[PDB]
Structures are given as C-alpha cells and as structure tokens.
Amino acid sequence: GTQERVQNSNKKEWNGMMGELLSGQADMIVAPLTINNERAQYIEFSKPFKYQGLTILVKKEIPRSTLDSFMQPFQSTLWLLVGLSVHVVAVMLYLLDRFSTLSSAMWFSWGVLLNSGIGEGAPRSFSARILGMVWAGFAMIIVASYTANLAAFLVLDRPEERITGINDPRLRNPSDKFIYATVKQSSVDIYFRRQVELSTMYRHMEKHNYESAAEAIQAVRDNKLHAFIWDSAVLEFEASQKCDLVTTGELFFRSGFGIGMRKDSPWKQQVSLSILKSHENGFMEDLDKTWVRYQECDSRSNAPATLTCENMAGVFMLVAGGIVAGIFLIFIEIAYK
C-alpha cells in the first residue's frame, strides 16, 4: 500500500492494505509492515518488533570442478618431452657404457623418475656417474614443480562479481542488460521516488516491477532477471533455505517492522509495553530460533576443501587399464620366450 491520486480529481487516497486500515475494515496491521515518513503521517506505529534493512539478491555463481586428473597441471607437450628424454638419457648412458647393459639402463632411468624401488643396474663408467646425479636432480625438480602448481591451482578463487550495493556503478548508469525489480506499490518504491538523485535508476526500474515476492524469487532463480532488491529479514531466510542464490553485503536504511494501529486508538501503550516485555524475556528469540535461523545451506565462498572420486577417474581408470593391458603383453612375451 502506498498513496496516489485517483479519478483525475484532487483526491489522493491509499491503495492497498494500509488503505484498508484507514477506511475501517480492520483495526490492526499484523504483518511485515515497514516504517517510513508518509505512512507514519497518520497511523500510530508500535515500537519496532524486528530490526533490519534493505539488501540485494543475485543468482549464485557456479564453481570450478575437482579436476580432470592430469589436465590442469601439465600440457601434453610436457608429457611427450619427458617421455622421449627418458630414452634419450638411457641411450646416452648405454653409449657411455659401451664406448669404454641397455635393458638395464631403460629400467634405471624409468625408475629414477618414478621413484619405484625396482631396478638393479648402475653406472659403471665414471663418465656416466657424472651424469646420473644431475639426471636425478632434474627428476626431483620436475616433480616438485608439479606439486607446487597443483597447490597453486587449488587456492586462487573466482573473480569479482560482488555487486556492492547502492554504489556499484553498475547500478547508476544501467546498460540495458541489467534489470532490477521491486514489488510494485511497496515501501521500497516510496523510498526511491522521493529521493532526488537516484531518480535516474528509478525510471530504469519502473518498467519491470513485479506483482509480489514469490514471482520475483522464482523469476530470478531462472535467469530472466539479474538483481532483486527487497527487505533483508526475508532475503536472509530465503537464501538459507534454497541455496543457489545469495545476498551481497550492504544495507540501505535501517528500519523496523512494527504493528500498526489506526489514529489514536486507546490501545497504544499496552501493545507497546507488551512488545518490549517480550523482547526482554527472550520469548521473541524463541520464536526466532523456531522460525528463522533453523536451517543452513552452504556459505564461505572460499570452499577450500572436499575433493572426491571425481579425481579418482583419470587415475583409477588408468590403473585398471594397466591391469587389462598387462595380460596381452604377458601372453606375447611368454610366447616370445
């Protein structure tokens, strides 16, 4: 409910449930009603029974996966390079052997990289022992680099979006890709139209406002609308329950839901006193825990943990493939015997 002119006459009346109260359809407004000047002109408000402010709401960003086992840290070219260089150093070893045990040397190098305990050869020629040391050094270097940059991958998070509030200049000169929204004829709308500066965005806001909350929620879930502006103590619970949405940080103008009564009913002070006494005896907070802060989906967009079988594919498939690809060559070699 807001105020507006009617019938193209000098009559300025009150649409909506507040207007209903003004005319004599009921004598108390128990609902999430806001507080502001216009409404406070002629209606008496109880002391505030819940404090909050305005805030924003956007579709939660989508994260990055666990990993494809071996994709992230290396390029295929690196794999090929090391693969060939193994046999390179192997044959060079064998040459330094003969010039002054091939099937040994291949083992020797492949093990030196793979850290496997297997293998029994050695560099007989001092010429080769001069080389083996640095070969091992290279091995250590490469494996260390690998682990380091895997660590680097797992800790740098996603970019900016973080719509800040009423000051993110993405909200002062709207490109026609953004669309705000608020509920028509609602306290928020009043807070805008009366402010002078914000006027611009007001117009950009005007051509899209919705009919009620649920429509707006459901319309930002499915990407048909970028940002939604509303009252916190609804948005917080809403994000907590269904958890692919999120609020962003700032508040706008701290106001409090309160009970509302017609102009000077004889009931004011009793109601106010009861509300206060309620806030003192924790009873209010019992309500709180019973209806608001009961459920928790995720938070802390860091998310620096929790890898699982998604990694296990690229490697367990490899080990099973090793199993299945052994038997064929085993048969082949027992035949070659």
Instruction: Detail the residues annotated as belonging to a binding site for glycine.
Output: 32, 34, 39, 187, 231
Question: Residue 30 CB, nearest distance to other proteins (Å)?
Answer: 18
Establish if 77 lies at the interface with other proteins (CB under 8 A). yes
Which of 7, 25, 65, 115 forms a contact with other proteins (CB under 8 A)? 115
Site for other proteins in 264-293 (CB under 8 A): 272-273, 276-277, 279-282, 284-285
What's the per-residue H, E or C state across 256-294? EECCEECCCCCCHHHHHHHHHHHHHCCHHHHHHHHHCCC
Establish if 101 lies at the interface with other proteins (CB under 8 A). no
Establish if 318 lies at the interface with other proteins (CB under 8 A). yes
Question: Residue 124 CB, nearest distance to other proteins (Å)?
Answer: 13
Is 32:234 a contact under the CB 8 Å cutoff?
A: yes
- C-beta closer to other proteins: residue 15 or 185: 185
Question: Residue 298 CB, nearest distance to other proteins (Å)?
Answer: 13
Stretch that binds other proteins, among 18-26, 36-44, 219-227, 238-246 (CB under 8 A): 36-44
Question: Residue 64 CB, nearest distance to other proteins (Å)?
Answer: 9
Nearest CA-CA partner of 88 in 63, 111, 106: 106
Question: Virtual CA dihedral for 211, 213, 214, 218, nearest 10 degrees?
Answer: 90
Is 176:81 a contact under the CB 8 Å cutoff?
A: no
* Structure tokens given for 94: 């064998």
DSSP-assigned letter for residue 169: G
Establish if 335 lies at the interface with other proteins (CB under 8 A). no
